[PDB]
Amino acid sequence: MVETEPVQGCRDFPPEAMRCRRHLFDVFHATAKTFGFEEYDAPVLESEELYIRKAGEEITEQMFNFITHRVALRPEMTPSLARLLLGKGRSLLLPAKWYSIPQCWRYRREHYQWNMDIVGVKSVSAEVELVCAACWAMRSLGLSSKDVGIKVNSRKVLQTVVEQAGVTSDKFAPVCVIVDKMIPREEVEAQLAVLGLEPTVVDAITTTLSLKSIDEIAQRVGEEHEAVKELRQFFEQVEAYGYGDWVLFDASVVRGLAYYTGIVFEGFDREGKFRALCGGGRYDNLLTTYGSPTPIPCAGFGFGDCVIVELLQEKRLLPDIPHVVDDVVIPFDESMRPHALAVLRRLRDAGRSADIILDKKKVVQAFNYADRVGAVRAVLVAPEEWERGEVQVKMLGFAVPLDRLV
C-alpha cells in the first residue's frame, strides 16, 4: 500500500473539505468584486532574491527554499505583487486594486491567503477600504462586530520615538520585528539590546505601545503628527462607511513584516482565543527598495484560510454543505439509456445540473443514489411514458412532456 497521507504539514481537500474551502473563497472573491478589485496571479515558485530583507522576520526565517538557481516556494505574495507592478512600470494605470488567493509555503507548512492591495493611493482612504473589505468578508461569513474586530495603529509614532533617541533608521524595521513579538517583556527587552538599544530607548518604546488612546498619542508626539492626523481620518472614514463598531485603536499593533511604513492593522476574535485572522498595512518604500525610479504608495493585507475556519467552526458558522444537483436521470433499464441521454442533454442545455445513472442498476437503487447526491429531482425514463412523449418526474411522482421538463 502507498502512503495515503499527504506530505508532512500539507492538507488534502476531498469534496467535503473542498466545499468548506469553496464557501470561504467564494466570500473572498465576492468581496473583492464588491470592492472593485481585479484578480491576479503569479508563480508559487519565485527567486529567493525576492525575500532577503535581513530584518529577522519570522516569515523569511521559515522559508521553504531550495536549489534547482536559488528559488523558493513563496512564503507570502506581496513581493510577487511588487515584481509584477515593477515590471509594468508607467504602463500601469493607477490607482490599481489587485487581489489573489495564493497558496503560500513554509518549512502546517502551507496555507491559502487572500491578498488585497491598493497601489498608487497616498491617502488613508486606502487603508480604510482595505479594512472595510476585511470586515465585509467576515460579516459575509456570518460573523458580527461582537465576534471580531480589527485593531489599528500607525508605525509612524514608534518611528518618531526611535529617531528621537538617535537610532539609525536602518534599525527601525528590526525594532518593529522585535516589538511585534511582545514572548515575555524581558525576552523582547533583551533582543532590542542586541540590536544596540540602551535601556532608556527601550523604556520609551515600551511606554508608547501601552498608550491606550489617540489623545494620549497626541499628548506625547503632538496633534499635528502625521500618525495622529492619519489615524483620525481613518476612523472618521470607517465610521462614515458604517463599520465603526468593527474597528479600534491599539498602540501595541506593529506587525512582523519589515516593510510596513504607516498604518498597520490586524483582525482578532473578541474572545481572545485565536491568533490573528488577518493582517496588513501601508508599505510606501517597498517598490523603492526594489529599484523603482519613483516611489509608489502601497497598502494591503493578507487573510489566511486556517484561523478563520477554526473561528467559524467554534461559532457553528461552518455547517456541512452537502453536495447538490438538480436532476438525476434514471433509465428504466439499458434499453432506455439512449433515450435517457437525449433527456439528460436537454436538461443540461437549459442550464440545469444533471446526472445520468452510469452503471447498471435497479430503479429503487437509482433513486437511493439520487438522494445520496442531494438531487432535487429524479427523472425516470421508462418505455411506457416514452411512447407518450413523456417521462416520470419525482421531487425529493408524475408524468411530464419533454418540452415541459425545463
Added chain:
Amino acid sequence: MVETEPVQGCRDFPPEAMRCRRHLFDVFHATAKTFGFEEYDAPVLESEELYIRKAGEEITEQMFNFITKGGHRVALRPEMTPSLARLLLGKGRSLLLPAKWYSIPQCWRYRREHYQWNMDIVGVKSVSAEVELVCAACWAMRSLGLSSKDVGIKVNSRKVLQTVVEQAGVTSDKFAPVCVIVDKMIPREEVEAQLAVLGLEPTVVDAITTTLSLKSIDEIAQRVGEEHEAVKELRQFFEQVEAYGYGDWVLFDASVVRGLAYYTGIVFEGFDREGKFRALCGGGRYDNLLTTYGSPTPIPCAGFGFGDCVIVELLQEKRLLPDIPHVVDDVVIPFDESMRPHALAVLRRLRDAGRSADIILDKKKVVQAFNYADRVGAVRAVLVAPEEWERGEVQVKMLRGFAVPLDRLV
C-alpha cells in the same frame, strides 16, 4: 532593479491575462457543475514514490523533483491522477461510489508549469463513464465557442493492441512500455528501434504497426472479431455519444494510445481539425491503477486532463478570446474631500445591494474622476455633490447626469 521577469518557464497573470484564464476556468467549473462533478484538491507537493511507474513515460522523465532538508524525496506534481488515487485509496470503503471528482491543479515539469482541468469517474465499469467524460470535454469546448468543425475527439481502445501483443507471446509487463513507445509514433524507424530494445521481434512490431493503421471499427472487427470487448465497447460508446447529440464531435482512430502507462481500455484525445496544434485534452480508462497502489478490491476509473495552454492558442486563432475589459457597476465620486464621508455612506448602500462599486480614493477633480470611471469600465458614475445631498440626492450618469434619491439608487 530586482528581476521583474518570472522564474524560468513560469507565467505571470496580471489582471488582463488573469481575465482570460478566469474565462477558461469558469467554463471548466460550469461544465463540471453541469455534469454533476464535485471539486477536490490536494497538495502540489507530493512524495516522489507516487510517480515511479518505470514505463519510460515522458511525464515521469520530466519530473520537477527534489530532496527536502529532512531527506525526503518529493516532487511538484507532474499530473493529478496519482494524487486522486491516493485520496480515493485513503477513503477506502467510506467513499460512496460512483464518484465524479474534478480539479484544476497547476502541474509542474523541469514552459515548466500549466493548469490542467482533471475530470474523473470512479466506480463505473461500463463505457458510460468514457461517454460522459468525452461529452464533458466537448461541452467545455462548445461553451468556449468552438464547433465540431473546429475540433473533435479521437477515440480508441487499448484492448485491441493488448490482444495483439498477447497473441505474439509477449509478457504482459511489456504492454505498458509498448503503449508508451507506440504513442511516440518521431520517425517510424525510431519507434521500431525502441520496441526492439524492449525485446520485440520484427514480426510482433509489424502486427503492432498494421493495427494502428486500421481505419475503422469494422476493420478492427475483421482482425480480432466482432464480439471482442474493444469492438463491443467502442460501438456502445459511439451509440451513446450519438444519443447525447455529440456524434459530429467524435470519431475512431486506431493510432491513439496516449503516453501514460496506466490506461487499460478506451483512450481518447481532443484535436483541432486544422492539424495545427498538439492535443487539447487526453484521457482514458485505468482500471488497475488502484490495485497497483494496494487497493484490496479493484476499482474502475476513467478520466481526462485538459491543459490551459493549447486551448488558449486555438481560441486566439479562432478569435474567440477577445480582450474582456474589467467592469464595475458604480464609481462613487465625492465632489470634494468635504463630501467623502457622505460618499462613503452612498458607497456602502451600493455594496449592500450587491453592486460592485468603487469610490475615488485619492484627491482629484470631478472630470478626472469621470475619466477614471470610464477607464475601469464603470457602468455608472455617481457624483456626490453638496447641492444634491441637501435634497437627499446624488447625480447619476450612465456610461447626461441626472439627480436621484438615495433609496432609489439600488
